[PDB]
Design a protein around this ligand. Structure first.
Ligand code: LN2
Ligand code: LN2
Lengths: 162, 163
């Protein structure tokens, strides 16, 4: 159920937020580290219904960008819907340390037959958002594979359709 | 949250279930009225993880139907994850009786600017599943519009991505 977040711009503007048009809605696509957007709890995949009282419906990505650049510093209110697409799947590493899926650019592309991912019904064409809690958005595939390896048997992955 | 369902085949060996492969997973695409599939609570959007202790990952819908069809035992055992893509949006009719969207083949195509659908972030390219608890999967657009006409001010709609 929607929430109202109040954000304040930093030194020279910039909320540290990249918005994207998807299905005539507006969604958070990137959250900068140590950003006013991250310090309030904004995450990749959160829907934005309202920016300073105004509806985002039908806004193109570049309109969403322009609207944010023109907002005044000490107050930027938004109506947010915490990751409407968010799903959380738990897997169990095998003898080789493998959970059972192939990924590319942070998106699951393949499911290994007879694996943990197959038993747990992990879906392809979904972005990996969090592994065990850590934000893996924007990370290179090698870094994601690293986090997966340095984790224990139970792997709590958070996926979202792409 | 996955649960094991035990379906019991009718006199025809049918269960009233149509399946569809989405993103290397198997999904329920149509549940016939008063069938063994409706009986156990299967619904459009439900993910089928296993069929008779056999993983559905990668399977095509023909493979899934072929497997349901084969092994004509009275009991089919499925592992079901309930509607993983289900989203509920509450809108309220304006002075004219409109929440503010356009649909074509049970799918939202457009959002009217400055409307309840816009205010509540309704998304296009989504299938309407339910309108105030009423199943609309399978119904024609005219029948969907009849439900909306006979609705109160509050219109609660369950939606899922079209894919
Ligand atoms: C049953 C069974 O489970 C099984 C069986 C045989 C296998 F070969 C594998 C398997 C072997 C290697 C991989 C590589 C796979 C990976 O390690 N995924 C994790 C989540 C995992 O599945 O553990 N990776 C690593 C990587 C790095 C950089 C770019 C892309 C990738 C990628 O796709 C995936 C699966 C898994
Ligand atoms: C503010 C504001 O809200 C506003 C204002 C002006 C408007 F013209 C409208 C509006 C008026 C009519 C319609 C037609 C629209 C509809 O009645 N949708 C329901 C869910 C609703 O939005 O109430 N329909 C009816 C229909 C029948 C058969 C096939 C397709 C359709 C279809 O798309 C859609 C929007 C809505």
């Amino acid at each position: 159920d929607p929430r109202e977040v109040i954000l304040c711009k930093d030194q020279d503007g910039k909320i540290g937020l990249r918005l994207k048009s998807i299905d005539n809605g507006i969604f958070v696509q990137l959250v900068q580290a140590n950003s006013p957007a991250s310090l309030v709890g904004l995450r990749f995949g959160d829907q934005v219904l309202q920016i300073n009282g105004e509806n985002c419906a039908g806004w193109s990505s570049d309109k969403a960008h322009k609207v944010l650049k023109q907002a005044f510093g000490e107050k930027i209110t938004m109506t947010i819907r915490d990751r409407p697409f968010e799903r959380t799947i738990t897997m169990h590493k095998d003898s080789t340390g493998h959970v059972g899926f192939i990924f590319k650019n942070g998106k699951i592309t393949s499911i290994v037959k007879d694996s943990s991912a197959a038993r747990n019904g992990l879906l392809t064409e979904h972005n990996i958002c969090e592994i065990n809690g850590q934000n893996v958005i924007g990370l290179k595939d090698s870094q994601i594979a690293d986090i997966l390896s340095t984790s224990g048997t139970v792997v709590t992955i958070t996926i979202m359709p792409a």
